[PDB]
Nucleic acid binder design. Sequence first.
DNA 1: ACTCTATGATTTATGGGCTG
DNA 2: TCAGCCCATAAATCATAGAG
Lengths: 59, 73
Amino acid sequence: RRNFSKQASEILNEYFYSHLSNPYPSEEAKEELARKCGITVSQVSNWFGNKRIRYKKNI
Amino acid sequence: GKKNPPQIYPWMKRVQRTSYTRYQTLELEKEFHFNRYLTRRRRIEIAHALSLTERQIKIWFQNRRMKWKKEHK
DNA sequence: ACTCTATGATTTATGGGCTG
DNA sequence: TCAGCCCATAAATCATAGAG
């Protein structure tokens, strides 16, 4: 179990922070992000889940 | 390490997590392989047998299916 | 060389919409 | 009807890949 590539994280973080007002990508958006990042939509969901929580946690 | 959002958005507001024992988990896992779904009765007898409530058993099975749905198996 | 932190996944639990 | 199902998500917690 390795970590996501450097480009995948930049892409997810960019999407995330660009949508700070509502970090809830649709099913399609999750699929497009997954395609570009080269992972599963499920990993995208986990990724947003952890990001969303860990973020509000450090506010 | 602290986050400084330019603005506090709604999703950013709020909305200990007990762990199940080897026995509880093992048994539940054991039951689920007998039938991925539970009857109001079976649900009650299993809840009493594991010191867990009915709700917790219902939910444990709900989550168990999502996991079963996932992993396509 | 070696220690922790941040990271990806998994485990309990909530709520809403939908159908037998 | 309405108890129970699915689905998406919360939040805490497990495990360990690597940045320090």
